[PDB]
Amino acid sequence: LPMMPPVGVQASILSHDTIRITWADNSLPKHQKITDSRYYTVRWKTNITKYKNANATTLSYLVTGLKPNTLYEFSVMVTKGRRSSTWSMTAHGTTFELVPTSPPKDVTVVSKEGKPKTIIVNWQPPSEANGKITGYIIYYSTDVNAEIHDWVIEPVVGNRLTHQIQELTLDTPYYFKIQARNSKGMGPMSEAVQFRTP
């Protein structure tokens, strides 16, 4: 005989890496207390992929170690002895964003053709964006050891991957670094790239 599958599965987002799953088992009384050896199995995955799973003898399961800003599909079944149920209807849960935790990648700086005091900076999004990138901030200086408040700031709006900087002094070594931004704040700076104006 088939067991009733769990119902009312819900995904409560607790952080950028934790989601608590809860459900009801209508084969139990309304007080929902378990007095037998049944156990539930919770499965989850990204719709980006195989399932991860875990068992529980509670009508809830805490899923930790997830990735930021990621949509997961969760479902639950029950087993007791040689009987079990089909999987429950799915519930979706998307983890919160987290500040980026890695830097913009492969930063390069070159001269703008025909405009020697102008340079073009190019880069790629950080691997650990951890949320929708909303912009970047480029910093540059003629002194690599200068404290950050002394570098010149060039904000870039949106998830653009290139930016031009004008009016630089000629025949001068400059250092450029960049950090990404999302709703949670600024990520780490890339390692400075040195470039000497022509």
Kindly report the CATH number assigned to the domain that includes residue 187. 2.60.40.10
Name the experimental technique.
X-ray
165, two tokens: 């900087």
One-letter amino acid for residue 92 of the chain: H
Beta-strand pair 173-182/135-141: antiparallel
Query: How far, in Å, CA of 61 to CA of 80, rounded?
Result: 18
Question: Which among 97, 161, 158 has a CA at the least distance from the CA of 126?
Answer: 161
Tell me, what amino acid is at 61?
Y
Which structure tokens are listed for 86? 């089909």
Q: Give the pair of three-digit tokens for residue 74.
A: 């969760």
Instruction: Look up residue 84 and give its two tokens.
Output: 């079990």
Six-digit token string for 156: 């870039």
10, 33, 37, 97 from 25: Cα distances, Å = 13, 10, 14, 32
C-alpha–C-alpha distance, residues 19 and 33, integer Å: 23
54, 124: one domain: no
Structural domain boundaries enclosing 87: 1-99
The residue behind tokens 């690599």 is 144
Could you say which of 71, 99, 127 is where a domain stops? 99
What is the distance between the alpha carbons of residues 119 and 190, in angstroms, rounded to a whole number? Answer: 18
Specified resolution (Å):
1.8
